Design a protein around this ligand. Structure first.
Ligand SMILES: NC[C@@H]1O[C@H](O[C@H]2[C@@H](O)[C@H](O[C@@H]3[C@@H](O)[C@H](N)C[C@H](N)[C@H]3O[C@H]3O[C@H](CO)[C@@H](O)[C@H](O)[C@H]3N)O[C@@H]2CO)[C@H](N)[C@@H](O)[C@@H]1O
Ligand SMILES: [Mg+2]
Ligand SMILES: [Mg+2]
Ligand SMILES: [Mg+2]
Ligand SMILES: [Mg+2]
Ligand SMILES: [Mg+2]
Ligand SMILES: [Mg+2]
Ligand SMILES: [Mg+2]
Lengths: 402, 154, 221
RNA sequence: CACUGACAGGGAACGUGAGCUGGGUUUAGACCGUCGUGAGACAGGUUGGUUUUACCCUACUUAGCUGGAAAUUGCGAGAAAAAGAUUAUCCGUAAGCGGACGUGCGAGCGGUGGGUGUACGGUACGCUCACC
RNA sequence: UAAUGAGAUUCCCUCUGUCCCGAGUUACUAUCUAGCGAAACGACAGUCAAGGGAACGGACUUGAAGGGCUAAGCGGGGAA
RNA sequence: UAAGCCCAAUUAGUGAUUGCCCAUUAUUCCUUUGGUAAGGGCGGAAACAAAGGAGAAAGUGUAGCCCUUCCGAUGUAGAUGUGGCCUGGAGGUUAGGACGAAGCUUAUGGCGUGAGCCUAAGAUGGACCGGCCUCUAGUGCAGAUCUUGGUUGGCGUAGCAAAGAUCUAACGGAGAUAUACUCAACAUGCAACGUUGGAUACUGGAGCGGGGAAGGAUUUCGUGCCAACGGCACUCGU
RNA sequence: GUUUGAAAAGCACUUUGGAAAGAGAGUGAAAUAGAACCUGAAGUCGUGACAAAGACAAUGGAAGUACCUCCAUUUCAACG
């Protein structure tokens, strides 16, 4: 007999299996489509999540009820130290797939790059990339570098480079990892001879985030969801909770199937891992590509808001610290907790809708505290509400006593 | 009348045996089978480390829904435990076997534990009281352990 | 499957010559899909090692729309309880042919698994198969003797590209690049092919004449 | 009655009680009407009336470990591969064509050594040990 | 028929997590270890689609799956 | 250019037969077994030492008196036959056993269609017992929600979750501070017991207070003591 | 059933352990006759040595083969 009333089923069935991610980092399963009429350019960049805040900006949207009026939008801060290129891979088309031809290396690799090869670096011989380093400038090894660079020019359709996050310029105390996060970034643009020349030129040289993205564009954010353990069916799938007088329990799915087919189906919601899942989340509009504090002591300062202040709030981002490097600022949320490495990748969606072409100018960036209720935008404003306090008048008493 | 196996050279091999241990059979099974190829001093080291809970006893036959632990990757297992009452009763038996090596004239630092065998003893009867007026058994299941150890030197 | 160091040191302790088993390589351009599959399913099960090549060129009788619907009725089948345990629907022409061979084998015994792993079934002609001897053909299954020429037929590479099989264009550029390469190799040695036949006509009258009228009785002149 | 773009019709042991609920049918109490001499009857009305067990196999959900292409073995040799496949340095294309350390002492491409500044802090680039 | 009722029913006020529509915290469990240690149950066992059949198969016919072994769940089957 | 439908062939207008694949059927050849079975031989023909051989019974049924011939053979419920098998005891006969009987054990073969029998080996046993003819019966197990004893998977699993709660130091105790080297200690003896002191709580006078009935009948008390019991523990204990 | 053995000759003594016990010695024809002790079954279990083996649950039939075999029988010279 049919179900007596209709509701749409619970949970998208295309995000199955809802199992833990195989790896903690965001990894692109597909790059944008290669336009060979463009100029060669990188397509992804790894940033780390550093809390979130909100902004104020006026809206250019003709027809809308909020046209030329100021909105408050939440933004997420993603710290981006530059990544250093260490390799060049090239992939050739087969009827099986897309096979790797080989990789050249940079002749000089970082300590934190070849730390990724060790479960224990400090208690080790540390001699990785040590025979490749010395063979690469022999007579036969300078041949073998140019041997496989030519094999890219013959067989490869896809040229990628291998970068790593360069975590020692990320002077962060809470991201506790010291080995670098390694991914491959695909070159798109030009023919294969024009991709390798851009792959050779930025080799053993750091690439900075504002050379990959622009200020008022969008991107995809490949990132791994915040993990929540084993959760039941109400938290995980969002099923309705049963009436109060139910025996053995409320937070269950009552019927898990008919008598026939005499099996539980994959469509029936069950309990298990919730969170720590990979998500791609397209069309994340970017609002500000920031600049390091060694360059910019005044990061959150706008034309329309001349308060001299950085992007880091009062008392720091909660659980994270201070944004010490370049940063991107995206509209809204990205999947994952703070401190987690995330991949900003160029969009595969058509970036032609009038919401996505819109140029962004800000008017205010909230640099108030995220601990408690934020009240002051700078520490100069808290020293004008509060005058000299007691601990200041006895520090001024030690400074006169000397 | 009890030893399943005899040593090669009995003049270089010390025996030890427990009559009725009154530990659990299914825990003294794995406490004792893990030392069946070890030297005497490496087998004694393992038991002082199971008590400190730094190494574990791999439960490979009578495991059956015990919790899985991080320390059983030493033995190629996933689940093992720290059965401290079967451990410290096997330490009294390794100390008997090495006392039986000294009075034979042998160096106990060269003794490899050949032949561990644990078998089931006669069970002991108690009683538990269930619902609705029922009475149902509460057995003990003790064990028989035996070992020699043969000296292998030079 | 690359050979391990146990399988590589024994080819150095014993000085193993490079070995190739007796492998029959069928060129399946313009073959009936199930008539070639039944000839192959019997030979594999008589102990023949068979490499099958050019599976995107196999033909199935009928309109392309007809045979494409019969694959989509096959793709309608899946285990509803758990489709990861379901019928697995292979879209490559090289994998459509392996299935059609396999459904003619005793698949659930070891003798029929030793015969389905004797079949390889590439599509296009890969670089390891090109220079390993002349390809063979199945003349009782070749569409010009088996299909009435007024009836439509269906190339398997075209039926399969519209139901899946995202490597149609890759195969078409690997086989355009081969026939260009293999026709450059064949304009070469045309002064080697003509060199021998102008030496095998010149070997006559340089050889004794009592071995030529026995070479003309059997028609080998 | 009202909203809606619309409030389609059904199946799955009249899907689904170790999922629930127990209103209703479907006991023992009691009342009423009609019936019966009575005990009682009533696809008649009424009220009150224990809903037990998973720790097993599978299925499904997640979570670990780990072999194996003769799917454990045969030594049973098949590369979506190079092109001496007959001897043997590479580079770049087929006709062509670039150079390739010379004989324990030397040299060359090089991994690590000492002192006064350059590119986007510390890594690179100037000017004793292996191999040819 | 006033008074009385752990009696049966209906509406209204106050009231609220009964509900919209769920969330979050606590104690105790579960869960992991030490000690101790059962029972129910048990032909043999245990992946499915269709066909046939004592006319709802785990075993038979033809197909489709299936590397081994585990921990926590769970209530679709075992006409449990 | 069927591997579909309807007709038709048998290697094709060539000259005449039966393309070939599969049975517990058919034909035929062996072996068994039973007949409403059918025949023959059974007065030792002669002869023959060791250093051509053995048998030959007047017979229902045997290791069938021996040959030759012919036909049948499955079967539930059921009937019957069996010089058919097996177990306890009895009457007779003939033999085994401390140089190893019964019993038990089995990659111990042998042979019987079979029920079964017999040999061998026990690094098993330690005193009884076999074969044949008769006689006798408490005489043959796989299942009766069979009886009694034991064992087993589940399974080191479910659990041992009401009555708030214990901590500390010193002593006691076998219950520790327990280590093969070239090791300073942590990372290689953990957990758990009693007593007194101290800290912290609880019961809260309808008390985990102090006495009696009924019921119990030594649980009282001291001293030893820890096998089993006090569902964990014990050095404590009703 | 107490039926250990012919007879307690019922394990002195040694040294590990707090002890139960263990390792040796000893008695006896026998201690794998050591105390509810002759024989010591089946089921079930441990251990040493091996044989292997995907997932067809297992068992089963037929017919070969591979390896094994404290088994039987036959054959070894102008002979089977
Ligand atoms: N191991 C396989 C099994 O052997 C069993 O039987 C075995 C045992 O019953 C039998 O016992 C052996 C005996 O062979 C051997 N020659 C002497 C030994 N005394 C016996 O052993 C007997 O005595 C010892 C102690 O004395 C006991 O521990 C043991 O449990 C007992 N079986 O050895 C037989 C094998 O030869 C089962 N009959 C059978 O189910 C199975 O095949
Ligand atoms: Mg977390
Ligand atoms: Mg009253
Ligand atoms: Mg009968
Ligand atoms: Mg009887
Ligand atoms: Mg508890
Ligand atoms: Mg109080
Ligand atoms: Mg107790």
């Amino acid at each position: 007999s049919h179900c007596k009333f209709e509701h749409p089923r619970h949970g998208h069935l295309g995000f199955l299996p809802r199992k833990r991610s195989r790896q903690i980092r965001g990894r692109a399963r597909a790059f944008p489509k290669d336009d060979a009429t463009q100029k060669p350019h990188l397509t992804s960049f790894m940033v780390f999540k550093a809390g979130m805040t909100h902004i104020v900006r006026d809206v250019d949207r003709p027809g809308s009820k909020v046209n030329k009026k100021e909105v408050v939008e939440p933004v997420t801060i993603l710290e981006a130290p530059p990544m250093v290129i260490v390799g060049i891979v090239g992939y050739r088309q087969t009827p099986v797939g897309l096979k790797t031809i080989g990789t050249v290396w940079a002749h000089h690799t970082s300590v934190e790059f070849r730390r990724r090869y060790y479960k224990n670096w400090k208690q080790s011989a540390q001699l990785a990339f040590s025979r490749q380093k010395q063979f690469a400038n022999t007579k036969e090894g300078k041949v073998a570098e140019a041997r496989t660079l030519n094999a890219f020019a013959k067989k490869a359709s896809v040229i990628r480079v291998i970068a790593h996050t360069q975590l020692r310029k990320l002077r962060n105390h809470r991201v506790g990892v010291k080995k670098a996060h390694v991914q491959e970034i695909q070159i798109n643009g030009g023919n294969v001879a024009a991709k390798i020349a851009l792959a050779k030129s930025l080799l053993e040289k750091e690439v900075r985030v504002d050379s990959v993205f622009q200020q008022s564009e969008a991107c995809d954010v490949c990132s791994v969801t915040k993990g929540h353990g084993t959760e039941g069916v109400v938290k995980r799938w969002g099923v309705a909770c049963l009436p109060r007088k139910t025996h053995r329990g409320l937070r269950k799915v009552a019927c898990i199937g008919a008598w026939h087919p005499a099996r539980v189906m994959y469509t029936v919601a069950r309990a298990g891992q919730h969170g720590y899942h990979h998500r791609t989340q397209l069309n994340k509009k970017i609002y500000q590509i920031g600049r390091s504090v060694a360059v910019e002591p005044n990061q959150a300062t706008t034309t329309y808001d001349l308060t001299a202040k950085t992007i880091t709030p009062m008392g720091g981002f909660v659980g994270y610290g201070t944004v010490r490097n370049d940063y991107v600022m995206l509209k809204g949320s990205v999947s994952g907790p703070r401190r987690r490495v995330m991949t900003l990748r160029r969009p595969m969606a058509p970036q032609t809708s009038r919401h996505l072409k819109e140029k962004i100018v800000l008017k205010f960036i909230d640099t108030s505290s995220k601990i408690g209720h934020g009240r002051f935008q700078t520490k100069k404003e808290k020293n004008q509400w509060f005058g000299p306090l007691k601990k200041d008048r006895i520090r001024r008493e030690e400074r006169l006593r000397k | 009348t009890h030893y399943s196996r005899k040593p090669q050279v009995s003049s270089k091999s010390a025996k030890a045996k427990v009559s009725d241990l009154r530990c659990h059979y299914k825990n003294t099974f794995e406490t004792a089978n893990v030392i069946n190829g070890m030297p005497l001093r490496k087998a004694q080291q393992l038991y002082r480390q199971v008590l400190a809970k730094t190494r574990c006893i791999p439960f490979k036959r009578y495991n059956g829904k015990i919790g899985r632990t991080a320390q059983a990757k030493e033995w190629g297992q996933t689940k093992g435990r720290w059965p401290r009452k079967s451990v410290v009763a096997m330490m009294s038996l390794l100390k008997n076997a090495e006392a039986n090596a000294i009075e034979k004239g042998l160096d106990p630092n060269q003794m490899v534990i050949k032949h561990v065998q644990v078998d089931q003893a006669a069970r002991m009867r108690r009683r538990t009281y269930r619902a609705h007026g029922r009475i149902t058994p509460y057995m003990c299941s003790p064990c028989h352990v035996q070992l020699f150890m043969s000296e292998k030197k030079e | 499957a690359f050979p391990s160091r146990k399988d590589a040191s024994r080819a150095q302790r014993k000085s193993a010559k490079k070995h190739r088993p007796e492998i029959i390589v069928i060129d399946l351009k313009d073959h009936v899909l199930g008539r070639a599959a039944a000839v192959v399913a019997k030979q594999l099960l008589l102990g023949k090692k068979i490499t099958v090549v050019r599976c995107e060129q196999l033909n199935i009788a009928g309109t392309e729309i007809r045979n494409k619907i019969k694959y989509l009725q096959y793709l309608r089948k899946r285990k509803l309880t758990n489709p990861t345990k379901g019928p697995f629907h292979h879209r490559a022409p090289s994998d459509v042919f392996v299935r059609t061979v396999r459904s003619m084998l005793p698949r659930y015994t070891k003798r029929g698994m030793k015969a389905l792993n004797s079949l390889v079934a590439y599509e296009g002609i890969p670089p390891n198969v090109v220079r390993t001897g002349g390809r063979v053909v199945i003349p009782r299954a070749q569409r010009h003797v088996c299909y009435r020429s007024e009836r439509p037929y269906t190339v398997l590479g075209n039926m399969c590209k519209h139901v899946g099989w995202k490597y149609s264009d890759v195969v078409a550029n690997l086989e355009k690049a081969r026939v260009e390469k293999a026709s450059r190799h064949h304009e070469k040695q045309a002064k080697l092919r003509e060199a021998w036949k102008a030496a095998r006509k010149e070997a006559l009258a340089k050889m004794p004449k009592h071995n030529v009228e026995v070479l003309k009785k059997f028609g080998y002149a």
